[PDB]
């Protein structure tokens, strides 16, 4: 259309996807991007610091016995995340969570 | 172009939110003083990049990668201003530290 006018709104975009990132929480960073389908720099890495993060709350919500949210976190995080480590310890308590939720 | 000052004034904030994000909090500084750029917020960058440093440290300490974390924790100790962020930071610090001594 203009070239200027379009690289200036995805420059917006991009830039309104990193300041709820900085000044607000990952939930609307992703919603954001989701709905505008941002290409965004780093997302990957990003995505597996969040996969971190959902291990590690999965984690102490498997430590206080809240196995039925834990297996939802480590879930979550398996399926976020390519990094081999992430998802070896998700897969590993998510099975842990199946085996206290099995009842048999 | 007020397009093409705007796209240049987006370009270097894209920039100095990668290197906040992505990079040490001096490194970012370092840019958005040579640039001289206007950054919406900007008192609130150091502490908040402090607080995800240990954030971040606690994730990694919480999958037990406690020589990755201390990284973390060193960082947002030296980086903060505030007492008690500070004491959090070397309290997760001195307990990596006792991991990789073995106890």
Same mark, same amino acid.
Do not use: P, Q, W
């Given at each position: 259309?203009?070239?200027?006018?379009?690289?200036?709104?995805?420059?917006?975009?991009?830039?309104?996807?990193?300041?709820?990132?900085?000044?607000?929480?990952? *939930?609307?960073?992703? +919603?954001?991007?989701?709905? /505008?389908?941002? &290409?965004?720099?780093?997302?990957?890495? =990003?995505? !597996?610091?969040?996969?971190?993060?959902?291990?590690?709350?999965?984690?102490?919500?498997?430590?206080?016995?809240?196995?039925?949210?834990?297996?939802?976190?480590? *879930?979550?995080?398996? +399926?976020?995340?390519?990094? /081999?480590?992430? &998802?070896?310890?998700?897969?590993?308590? =998510?099975? !842990?969570?199946?085996?206290?939720?099995?009842?048999?």
């Amino acid at each position: 259309h203009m070239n200027l006018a379009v690289k200036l709104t995805r420059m917006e975009k991009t830039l309104k996807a990193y300041e709820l990132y900085i000044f607000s929480d990952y *939930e609307n960073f992703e +919603n954001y991007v989701k709905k /505008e389908g941002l &290409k965004i720099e780093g997302m990957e890495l =990003l995505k !597996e610091k969040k996969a971190r993060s959902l291990i590690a709350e999965g984690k102490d919500l498997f430590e206080t016995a809240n196995y039925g949210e834990a297996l939802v976190f480590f *879930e979550k995080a398996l +399926n976020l995340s390519d990094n /081999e480590e992430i &998802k070896k310890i998700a897969s590993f308590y =998510l099975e !842990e969570c199946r085996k206290k939720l099995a009842g048999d």
